[PDB]
Structure 1
């Protein structure tokens, strides 16, 4: 997760790495894992994803 630039202008671009992790792989880890719920979350909350 490496930023830094030239020409002092407190830009942005910290969001560029906001979409390759962040709270992303934290929600998975936050409280507990999944165990059987992934047995019904990628193979069940998938009915969410067919169109």
Structure 2
């Protein structure tokens, strides 16, 4: 998640590009999973429910 900003460029647009890069790399979800431990059975059940939702979509 490294972003390079060109010379004489607004700060806000670079900030927005950095946010897009972080979203593309999916950094936040890793930290969200890390913050709290989750039971493996709960993980498996959630994965199955997500799979069913994806199938309906």
Task: Give the TM-score band, short-chain normalised.
Answer: 0.5 to 0.7
Q: Which runs of 5+ in 1 are unaligned?
A: none
Total equivalences in the alignment: 51
When you count helix as a share of all residues, which structure comes out higher?
2
Q: Which runs of 5+ in 2 are unaligned?
A: none
TM-score normalised by structure 1 residue count: 0.67
When you count strand as a share of all residues, which structure comes out higher?
2
RMSD: 1.8
TM-score normalised by structure 2 residue count: 0.63
- The higher-RCO structure (CA 8 Å, 6+ apart) is 2
